Amino acid sequence: NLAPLPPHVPEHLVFDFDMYNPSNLSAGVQEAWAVLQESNVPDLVWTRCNGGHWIATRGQLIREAYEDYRHFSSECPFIPREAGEAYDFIPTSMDPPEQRQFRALANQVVGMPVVDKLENRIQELACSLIESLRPQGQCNFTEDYAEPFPIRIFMLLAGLPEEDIPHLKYLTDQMTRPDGSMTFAEAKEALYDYLIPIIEQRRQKPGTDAISIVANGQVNGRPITSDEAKRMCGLLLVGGLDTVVNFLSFSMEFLAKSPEHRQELIERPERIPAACEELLRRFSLVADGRILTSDYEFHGVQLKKGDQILLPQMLSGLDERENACPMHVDFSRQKVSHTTFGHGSHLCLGQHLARREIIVTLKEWLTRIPDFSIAPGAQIQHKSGIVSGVQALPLVWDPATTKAVHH
Ligand code: HEM
Ligand SMILES: CN1CCC[C@H]1c1cccnc1
Known part of the structure; x- marks a missing residue:
C-alpha cells in the first residue's frame, strides 16, 4: 500500500499513482498515465505508492530534468528504491562525464552503421514470419510476431542461441514488469549469471558478434573490464527483448482498430516512415527517471x-x-x-x-x-x-483478402 508521507512533502501535491498498476489501466495504458495530465493535477506530484517518489507530469518538466544531470542523477534510475540502487547497467546508471565514453562502444554494435548492414536480414525475417501466418487467418500477435521478430534479430546479432529466449525473456520482464516471484536484484544477477561465462569465453576466443565486440572493446583508449562488459551487455539484452517487442503490439492493436489509418498507408507507402514516428509518440512506453543529488528547489x-x-x-x-x-x-x-x-x-x-x-x-x-x-x-x-x-x-482476418508477396 502507501508509504508514510515525508516531512517536506506538501499534502496538496499527493496523487497516489501506481506505475506498476495504474487505476485507469483498462482504458489503455497510455490513457491511464494521462490522468496525471488532467487540468486539476499539478506539473510535479508525489505518490505514496511503491515506496514514494515524485512524478513530473509535463514535457517541459520532464525534458528539463533529463538535461540537468547535475541535480538529477541516473545512478538510481528506477522505482522502487531497491531496484534503482541495484541497477548498474552501462551506460544507463552513469552520469556525464563518466558515461559518455561508453556510448561510442555501444554504438559499435547497434549504431546506424550496423543497422544499415542488417536491413536485408531484418526484412527477410519479417516476411517469413508474416507469410507463415497469412494463411491461418489468425494469430496471437504477441507470441507469434512481436516477441520472435525483434528477439531473434538480437539473439542472432549477439551470438546467443534461440533456445535461450524463454529464460532470458522471463528475466528481463522481472526487471520491467515484475510478477512478484523475483526482486530486481535477483533477476539482474540471474542475467549476469548467464552472461559471465560467455563474456569470459568471448574474451578468450572472440567472434564478430555483439558480445565479442563489447567484451573486447575499448573506451577512450583503455580496454574495457570484464565487469563493465557485463553491465553493458545486460543493457543490450533488455533492449532487444523488451522494447520493440512491446511497441509493435501497441502499434498493431491501433492498426487493427483503425481500417482508416492502415488504408492511409497502403495507398501512400511513402508516409510509413512518418507514420512510425507518430505511433512512437502516441504509444510511447518507457518510464524511468533520476535521483536527487542535493536539496533543490524545482519549479x-x-x-x-x-x-x-x-x-x-x-x-x-x-x-x-x-x-x-x-x-x-x-x-x-x-x-x-x-x-x-x-x-x-x-x-x-x-x-x-x-x-x-x-x-x-x-x-x-x-x-x-x-x-x-x-x-x-x-x-x-x-x-x-x-x-x-x-x-x-x-x-483475425479473411485469408481471401490477403496476398502472398515474394521477398
Ligand atoms: C522502441 C524501442 C525502444 C525504446 C522506446 C527505447 C527507449 C530508450 C530510452 C527512453 C532510453 C533512455 C533512458 C534513460 O534516460 O535512462 C534508452 C536508452 C538506451 N537504449 Fe533504448 N529504446 C528502444 C530500443 C532499444 C534497442 C532495441 C536497443 C539495443 C539493442 C536499445 C539500447 C539502448 C541503450 C544502449 C541505451 C543507453 C544509452 C545511455 O545510457 O546513454 N534501445 N532507450
Ligand atoms: C530504462 N530503459 C529504457 C529502455 C529499457 C529500459 C530498462 C528497463 C529495465 C532494465 N534496464 C533498462
Whole structure:
C-alpha cells in the first residue's frame, strides 16, 4: 500500500499513482498515465505508492530534468528504491562525464552503421514470419510476431542461441514488469549469471558478434573490464527483448482498430516512415527517471537529496501543451514532438534499429495482410511498468483478402 508521507512533502501535491498498476489501466495504458495530465493535477506530484517518489507530469518538466544531470542523477534510475540502487547497467546508471565514453562502444554494435548492414536480414525475417501466418487467418500477435521478430534479430546479432529466449525473456520482464516471484536484484544477477561465462569465453576466443565486440572493446583508449562488459551487455539484452517487442503490439492493436489509418498507408507507402514516428509518440512506453543529488528547489517544489523522481518518457508526447490533439493519431502531424527515446545525455542508441524494425513490420505486414482486426469479443488488456506492454493481442482476418508477396 502507501508509504508514510515525508516531512517536506506538501499534502496538496499527493496523487497516489501506481506505475506498476495504474487505476485507469483498462482504458489503455497510455490513457491511464494521462490522468496525471488532467487540468486539476499539478506539473510535479508525489505518490505514496511503491515506496514514494515524485512524478513530473509535463514535457517541459520532464525534458528539463533529463538535461540537468547535475541535480538529477541516473545512478538510481528506477522505482522502487531497491531496484534503482541495484541497477548498474552501462551506460544507463552513469552520469556525464563518466558515461559518455561508453556510448561510442555501444554504438559499435547497434549504431546506424550496423543497422544499415542488417536491413536485408531484418526484412527477410519479417516476411517469413508474416507469410507463415497469412494463411491461418489468425494469430496471437504477441507470441507469434512481436516477441520472435525483434528477439531473434538480437539473439542472432549477439551470438546467443534461440533456445535461450524463454529464460532470458522471463528475466528481463522481472526487471520491467515484475510478477512478484523475483526482486530486481535477483533477476539482474540471474542475467549476469548467464552472461559471465560467455563474456569470459568471448574474451578468450572472440567472434564478430555483439558480445565479442563489447567484451573486447575499448573506451577512450583503455580496454574495457570484464565487469563493465557485463553491465553493458545486460543493457543490450533488455533492449532487444523488451522494447520493440512491446511497441509493435501497441502499434498493431491501433492498426487493427483503425481500417482508416492502415488504408492511409497502403495507398501512400511513402508516409510509413512518418507514420512510425507518430505511433512512437502516441504509444510511447518507457518510464524511468533520476535521483536527487542535493536539496533543490524545482519549479517551486522543495525536493531533498535522495528523493527519487520518475520522469516518464511516455508523457512528453501525450502532453497537450506539446501536441494539440494528443490522443489522436494523425500521420500528417507537422511537428510530431516527443521524448520516446529519452532526452539528454542518455538518448537511446538503439532507436535506429528500433525504427527499421517498426518500419519493416508496417510495410511487410500491410503488404500481405491489409485487412484484419481484433478477434471476436476479445478485450485487449495492457500491462504497466518501467516498460509497458500488451498482455495479448489476438487478431483475425479473411485469408481471401490477403496476398502472398515474394521477398
Ligand atoms: C522502441 C524501442 C525502444 C525504446 C522506446 C527505447 C527507449 C530508450 C530510452 C527512453 C532510453 C533512455 C533512458 C534513460 O534516460 O535512462 C534508452 C536508452 C538506451 N537504449 Fe533504448 N529504446 C528502444 C530500443 C532499444 C534497442 C532495441 C536497443 C539495443 C539493442 C536499445 C539500447 C539502448 C541503450 C544502449 C541505451 C543507453 C544509452 C545511455 O545510457 O546513454 N534501445 N532507450
Ligand atoms: C530504462 N530503459 C529504457 C529502455 C529499457 C529500459 C530498462 C528497463 C529495465 C532494465 N534496464 C533498462
